[PDB]
Amino acid sequence: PQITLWKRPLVTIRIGGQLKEALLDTGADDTVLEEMNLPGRWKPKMIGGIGGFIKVRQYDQIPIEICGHKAIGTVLVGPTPTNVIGRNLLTQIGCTLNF
Amino acid sequence: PQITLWKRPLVTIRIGGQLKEALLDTGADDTVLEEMNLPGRWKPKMIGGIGGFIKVRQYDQIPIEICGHKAIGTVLVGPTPTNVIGRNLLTQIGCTLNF
Ligand SMILES: C[C@H](c1ccccc1)[C@H](C[C@H](O)CN1CCN(Cc2cccnc2)C[C@H]1C(=O)NC(C)(C)C)C(=O)N[C@H]1c2ccccc2C[C@H]1O
């Protein structure tokens, strides 16, 4: 689909049989979701943004459905202000910026 | 043009007669630029990102060019690690997200 930007680009995602809302974020290198439970082993990691750095849990090869399109990649979980879908998954679904 | 997301979507912008590299960020509601001495009056403001809030200076009706596309709007100036073009300006140049 084609998404305009007069409103935040939010979409529904399906992760672990759970529905959630996320922001399509081209300025984010990675994908971060609010604190939640995910199966599998996770490794501690730190990511920085405006404001500073935070500690997150890193899950690898996680299947995630974004607005109908399937993806499988790294998902970070931690105290983020909102669920963000980064470039690592945006590229998996063939997402581009146009103008 | 059409921009892929394999790399950070960086483009050239011109503001205050200066050429700078900026990140096209669909996840940012506002536009944030690295510290610079713009002329004109401004208002103090706090904006929050991944790891907290940073204090910035708000300049209104600032003319700015993004890849040869002229636009004008609000710009925040502060200690941001990188220049960020938010949705307030992306909409002006008819930028869309597509997949
Ligand atoms: C320019 C940022 C950057 C910093 C350093 C290096 C490159 C880019 C970039 C910004 C995010 O695209 C957008 N981000 C999403 C979450 N919400 C949250 C919010 C916070 C407070 C109030 N409302 C909403 C904040 C919003 C944001 O930072 N907005 C502004 C107006 C303050 C600019 C960002 O945070 N990037 C990092 C990043 C992000 C997620 C996962 C991994 C990584 C690594 C980095 O690429």
CATH of A1-99, picked from 3.40.50.2300, 3.40.50.280, 2.40.70.10, 3.90.1150.10, is 2.40.70.10
Method: X-ray
* Closest Cα in chain B, distance from residue A91 (Å): 6
Nearest CA in chain A to B83: A27
Minimum-distance ligand 1 atom for the alpha carbon of B29: 31
Helix or strand run (H / E) with residue B1: none
Contact B47, B76 (CB under 8 A): yes
C-alpha B32 – ligand 1 centre gap (Å): 11
Residue B66: both structure tokens together: 């993004």
Q: What is the rounded radius of gyration, in angstroms, for the C-alpha atoms of chain A?
A: 13
The β-bridge partners of B64 are: B15, B71
SS3 B17: coil
**A25 is an active site residue:** yes
Task: For residue A88, give every residue at least 6 positions away whose Cβ sits within 8 Å of its Cβ, in sequence order, or none.
Answer: A29, A30, A31, A73, A74
CB contact under 8 A, B96 and A97: yes
C-alpha B27 – ligand 1 centre gap (Å): 7
Contact B32, B85 (CB under 8 A): no
How many C-beta atoms lie closer than 10 Å to residue A94's C-beta?
A: 11
Residues of B labelled catalytic: 25
Contact A84, A28 (CB under 8 A): yes
* Closest Cα in chain B, distance from residue A75 (Å): 16
Task: For residue B76, give every residue at least 6 positions away whose Cβ sits within 8 Å of its Cβ, in sequence order, or none.
Answer: B30, B31, B32, B33, B45, B47, B56, B57, B58, B59
CB contact under 8 A, B91 and A5: yes
Pocket test for ligand 1, best of B8, B33, B50, B55 (most atoms within 8 A of CB): B50
Contact A94, A80 (CB under 8 A): no
Taking alpha carbons only, the member of A21, A68, A61 closest to residue B99 is A68
Structural domain boundaries in chain A: 1-99
Rounded CA-CA distance A54/B89 in Å is: 28
DSSP string, B20-51: EEEEE-TT-SS-EEES----S--EEEEEEETT
Helix or strand run (H / E) with residue A44: strand A43-49
Dihedral-angle region of residue B93 (phi above 0 means left; psi in -120 to 50 means alpha; beta otherwise): alpha
Burial of A74 (0-12, 13-18, 19+ CB in 10 A): middle
Instruction: List residues of A whose CB lies inside 8 A of any B CB.
Output: 1-6, 8-9, 23-29, 32, 47-54, 67, 69, 80-81, 84, 87, 90-91, 93-99
